Design a protein around this ligand. Structure first.
Ligand code: FE2
Ligand code: FE2
Ligand code: FE2
Ligand code: FE2
Ligand code: FE2
Ligand code: FE2
Ligand code: FE2
Ligand code: FE2
Ligand code: FE2
Ligand code: FE2
Ligand code: FE2
Ligand code: FE2
Lengths: 161, 161, 157, 162, 162, 162, 160, 161
């Protein structure tokens, strides 16, 4: 039971993208938490955990095919100061991930492999959901205003429910 | 208030080492999982989560001191086939970590900073206990034999109270 | 709403393989259970029940497409004394099922049918997982040796 | 200890018959359910599970005496369209089963084997009860009428108050 | 209501065999317990309790038949050092027991008495199960290796927490 | 009242003996813990607590008679690197304790005292159980093999009272 | 750790006598239950189980001393048809047991042994209590009359 | 990874001092309990158990660095008759303990070690608290007297309510 190297390198590209996304999201969460924007921090922490789940399932599938999960390679990681630029950066990361996912899914589906294809649509569906959320947030801040929108998410105490 | 760049770079080096430890321990746990090893997998995943707690407290502390943590870079990650070699790799990475931590702790205890010293001493105690566990496991396996030792890890029981 | 003959024949072949597999799994499980190897018996009988559920889904689907199930025939069943030969036989059965199912899934998706495609992908996933387990266990026993693997793993709780 | 070959081959024949019965009953359960006749489907599923238990205990007994249980060979399996023909088919199956059971028990009873005689008695009682049920239902459908009978065994409700 | 003298002698012989089985099993259980082996000790203690239950039912049945049970006679008792002698002697006593049971059941069913016969085949089935267990453990220890196998029954690894 | 010097000196000697036993057993348990062997450590810890209780009750008994318990002096405590020699050392100190206790209890029963003779009896019984367990353990480890036996203790404890 | 021949042989003799007593008690219990004297049957079953536990502790002690217990040889057992003779057999076996027990306890206490001495002390106490019960029951049965006592002990409350 | 000698005999001597302390405290508690002074006995028993925990953790640390614990040697153990001499003996023992612990903690803090220093301030804090308690007890006994203090501590062990 073995596979051709093209599917393995597709999966490894996706894995490295997921690790970089994890690091970027966690850095964003910590920075915006130090700023004082709490709800964004919680939401991006949840997103980070989701990305770890994706990385875990990808690792499982690649180790199934008797591959070598490479952890050394990383992509370019970028950070921002205001919410607009970090949202934009996450948007481009998601765009690159989804484009790579579509290309890999077509190429590998043409090879008569199925299960990796399944984990691929799972990943692309979650990425599409997150990028839609980010785009909605960007349009919201564009229409509303930076200062007041940042004032929306400030809080000091916690809710009982 | 501000911190001198030296403690910033010590914290950056410690953060890089901790991230490398995360990736190494996690990949190792996964390899033991796939090969059929169960107890060692759980112990390694517990160690990985503890190192992640270390990374969390370190990045919070450095962000407190107007720092700019860097996640792009990583050290060199080592993987092994049988238990002895990645045991040795964990040993050597922990030795490097403890040497660096001792140097850093003395250097900023000499220069008017105590909190980061407390963080490093806590991390040092944790890594000391971990390396003791590794050393006693190594002595056990060299005294008892590889096959007979590995005979007691697989259980295939799955109980529930 | 009538079915397509090659679809029906592919479903029937997969079903017959399922019946042969469940019979083989049950025989082997009983064999090690009489030997005194309880854990293998439990795991193998659980796998047999899983293949039974697979076959039930298969037959419900083939009845849905207005076809006639045939159970009068079944493939050869092979057994063994040591665990190694039976494990190898199970590996061979699962591999042949995987190859046949891949060919069937390709032609069936190409012939504009979707539901049987998703039941087939689920079956492929399950069989791939079982193949993974069998191969890792075979590697483990090859490394440890027969008596050492058999003795210290006996447990009850 | 080791058993005589004749009882071994009697046990193997009974195992084959039990496997065929399991197969046929599962067919009829699924087919009736697809027709839309829920109660008979549930009854037939219960019968199939009982025959599975019978086969399991028989296999355990035959493996006890250091035999070689084989499931490669099967008897003929017949499929019926309406309820009448499949009732008659099950009737013939149970009749041949009880015939073989009586002959085998009388044979082996004289060669100082007792426990397998007892399991043959148990399976004989089970199949006798089942065949009594089948004959009663056949007479009932004959007297009342097929259409009216199956009229009262249908419901598209699936009710569950809680 | 008086039973036949041969019935009484058969019941008495079986009772004597049961008493010998009780004594041997208890002495063994004590020996494995002193050696430190736990699972073997508890299993053979349960076996001895089951044999005592068999003696109970047999003595009730013979007492009902208006007889005088003899609690004086006892067969020979065998003791060895290793597990192999344990299993071999137990297999021997169970084999002679099964032979006596088969002869007794045949003659009892021949001479118009049933309830005693029924408890006869009950004891027969229980003892054949015990023989199967003993034989499979003998095969396992023969194949596995004495020290490697015995490493299993002994274990001090904090079993209290559950 | 006040006791004659013989009983007082024997009790003081016993106190020294159990202090030595407590220290030796605690060090053995700790070293067993460091090498990763789990169950032996907890068993030896329980033995240490038992010896602590023994020392407490003996000190109470001697102080009742307006004596002066001594805690300044000890005996020779010895340490081992492997299992065999620490088992042997425990056996040696145990044999010395048993012989001294027997002599003292005899001579002191000969000089009109029973209550302290009774507590000596209790200590004798507990120490006898400890030595029997030690001897059984030594025989098992010599028969089975050091490495294979040591494989049986290292892990797989799972204490879960809930 | 090996014990002397005298102590181990005394232990073996006591164990054999006790095993015979267990067998006798069980036999009498079953015959009492057969004829409907249920309360006596319960009492005898309890006494037999107590003797079983005593034999268990005795064989544990003898096996502790690198001994070789024997379950092969037994002493003679006696049976009775009415209460008086079975009670008398019980009392006489108790008397012989306690006499041998006193001799053994004296000898062992002279031969530098304690734990076995204590366990024989306990068994002696319990047999003293049991013989007291047997004697008081025999005297009560004598005074009252057999028929009235049998009428007293009957249950007849079998559920079915 | 083992430490130098100076630290190891400092720890071994401290362990011996702890053993002497536990024995002396237990003897004092037993004596006061016999005399009928119950609450004093309870407090002394609690102190002895705490000192035993000290000994256990300290010998655990000794073994940690691949040491050779010695239980053979013992310091002097002194006994008294009234509460005054017992308290004074305890005060002298505690004074020696604090002095030597301070010198040891400084000398090995100056030699790139942290964990042993940490357990040393733990022990030092405990000993400071204990010497405070003994000092205030002696001062109160001096202020009030002898018989009244015993009357305060003494209680009737009725055990019938
Ligand atoms: Fe993703
Ligand atoms: Fe995590
Ligand atoms: Fe650590
Ligand atoms: Fe099944
Ligand atoms: Fe399947
Ligand atoms: Fe049935
Ligand atoms: Fe029993
Ligand atoms: Fe029996
Ligand atoms: Fe002692
Ligand atoms: Fe303690
Ligand atoms: Fe007795
Ligand atoms: Fe202290």
């Amino acid at each position: 039971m073995q596979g051709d190297p093209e599917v393995i390198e597709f999966l490894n590209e996706q894995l490295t993208a997921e690790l970089t996304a994890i690091n970027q999201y966690f850095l964003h969460a910590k920075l915006q938490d130090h700023k004082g924007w709490t709800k964004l921090a919680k939401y991006t922490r949840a997103e980070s955990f989701d990305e770890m789940r994706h990385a875990e399932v990808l690792t499982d599938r690649i180790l199934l095919l008797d591959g070598l999960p490479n952890y050394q390679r990383l992509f370019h990681v970028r950070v921002g100061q205001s919410v607009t630029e970090m949202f934009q950066a996450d948007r481009e990361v998601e765009l690159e991930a989804i484009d790579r996912l579509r290309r890999g899914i077509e190429v590998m589906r043409a090879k008569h492999d199925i299960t990796s294809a399944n984990v691929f649509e799972a990943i692309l569906a979650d990425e599409e959901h997150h990028i839609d959320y980010l785009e909605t947030q960007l349009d919201l801040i564009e229409k509303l205003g930076e200062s007041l929108y940042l004032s929306t998410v400030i809080e000091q105490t916690q809710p009982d429910p």
